[model samples]
Target: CGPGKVQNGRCCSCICVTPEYHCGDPQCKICKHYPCQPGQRVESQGDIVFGFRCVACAMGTFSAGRDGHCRLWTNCSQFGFLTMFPGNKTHNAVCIPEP
Candidate 1:
């Protein structure tokens, strides 16, 4: 589910880290992450056998952090609203009130 890959190693015994760590022993398995929050993104680096970590998104971008995907904010002008309020890593664009 999360990033990382298993390799040649002894499992030693059954182990669990997060919610997704479940199975018998002797096999290495990576686990999923706690859903990322807004403005955060999952990085592709870290313990290759454990998993990657989350990081903040770049400017002009917003990430609900769901499924490790980042998205652009909505443009108010396209939706018949007034000018858009610029978006940041954590928040989407805001628009003028409807009349």
Candidate 2:
């Protein structure tokens, strides 16, 4: 029903003059769910142990990065038509009036 708990670790680096600790404990189990937003893509980069992250290709924009921050829209010849506003980490597909 909900995502599993994740135990992160702290780290200490000489460059920063801080102590960093890591999780020595075994990896915990993670649960997965469905019904993500439309235009969003989920990929399994890791094994079953870890879950997938929901990502999207923004409409009117497209790019590449770890987050939806990078996205661009396709080149449209005409205007006043409904273009699929892609979903990215920023926002969802809402109809936008042509300029």
Candidate 3:
């Protein structure tokens, strides 16, 4: 018998079948608290905490700290290659390629 795809004990949601699925890496778009893979960068701001969904480290950007709070990427004059983008509410900022 095939191992039915189940997550958190529920049959895969209809949305889970989509190509965007990230294997076992469940989407953390709107999570209150989450963790990134070991050694991976994670950050947030305010009440937010560190996790994989917000662990984005680009050359011109900085990741959030254990508290999961990062300043605006583009706001940093030192970050010449950093650009801003939309992300989850818990995330402080999204890093994008320099334009």
**How close is each model in CA RMSD to the real structure?**
9.7, 13.3, 12.9
Q: For each candidate, what is the lDDT?
A: 0.55, 0.37, 0.36
Name the top TM-score candidate: 1
Candidate 2 residue lDDT tens string, 1-99: 113333232212101111121111123233344332444544445543434555664455443333223344433335555546544444434455665
Candidate 3's C-alpha runs over 4 A off are: 1-31, 36-54, 69-99
**Candidate 2 lDDT score at position 74:** 36
Q: Highest lDDT: give the candidate number.
A: 1
CA-RMSD of model 3 = 12.9
lDDT of 3 at 74: 46
Q: Is candidate 2 or candidate 3 better by TM-score?
A: 2
Off by over 4 Å in 1: 1-31, 46-50, 65-67, 97-99
> Which lDDT tens digits does candidate 1 get at residues 1-99?
223445323333333333323222224344445455667765554334444556777776687545444677788878788755677777788889688
- Candidate 2's C-alpha runs over 4 A off are 1-32, 48-50, 58-99
Q: Roughly what TM-score does model 1 have, to 2 decimal places? A: 0.48
TM-score of 2: 0.24
